[PDB]
């Protein structure tokens, strides 16, 4: 019976598409700023809690965002995204490409589509994610583990992150 912090997702294996819907108690302004900086996203987004490092981020219509997550011992993951249209905070789409290192991008790794939509419902902001790409086997393993680890880490990290952003630290409350 919870209203805010709602979690709902649907996957269509036949159509090979992934739909994730989430509801948070915050204005589009604050939410948009969170997706406008990879540093903020690194705080919660990007599963595998360890060390995330953004190689570069050019805020431009034809700009691109390159980042790679680093895990424990031997384990690294590289990814790259290309922005096509920015458009007002309303809604926009981009492209998600897989990377194995720097920008080698192997042929066995097809590009993926990821459209981002921001809907403002009064004092509650709702965000809809649309991701779809080939490689069903990898999709089933990445979505199952990514969804379980992503929502658990995102829910815990996001909860603390929202509190820090909203309630600003000032001094200890006493007397």
Residue among 7, 3, 4 at smallest CA distance from 147 = 7
Instruction: Delineate the domains of the chain, giving CATH numbers in brackets.
Output: 1-175 (3.30.530.20)
Give the position of tokens 């490092």. 53
What is the spatial distance between Cα 154 and Cα 145, in angstroms, rounded to a whole number? 13
What is the spatial distance between Cα 63 and Cα 29, in angstroms, rounded to a whole number? 22
Method used experimentally: NMR
The secondary structure of 50-95, three-state, reads: CEEEEEEECCCCCCEEEEEEECCCCCEEEEEEEECCCCCCCEEEEE
Residue 158 CA, chain-centre distance (Å), reads: 11
What is the spatial distance between Cα 23 and Cα 29, in angstroms, rounded to a whole number? 15
């Amino acid at each position: 019976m919870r209203t805010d912090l709602a979690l709902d997702f649907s996957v269509n294996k036949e159509n090979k598409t992934i739909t994730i819907k989430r509801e948070f108690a915050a204005v589009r302004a604050i939410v948009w700023e969170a997706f406008t900086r990879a540093e903020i996203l690194d705080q919660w987004w990007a599963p595998k809690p360890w060390k995330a490092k953004t190689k570069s981020m050019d805020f431009k219509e034809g700009g691109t965002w390159l980042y790679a997550m680093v895990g424990p011992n031997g384990e690294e993951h590289w990814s790259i995204c290309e922005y096509a249209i920015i458009k007002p905070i309303e809604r926009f789409t981009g492209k998600d490409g897989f990377t194995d290192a720097s920008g080698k991008l192997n042929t066995e790794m097809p590009r993926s589509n990821w459209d981002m939509r921001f809907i403002d419902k009064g004092e509650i902001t709702e965000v809809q994610y649309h991701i779809s790409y080939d490689d069903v086997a990898q999709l089933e393993a990445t979505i199952q583990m990514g969804f379980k680890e992503g929502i658990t880490m995102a829910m815990e990290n996001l909860d603390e992150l929202l509190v820090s952003g909203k309630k600003l630290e000032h001094h200890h409350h006493h007397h």
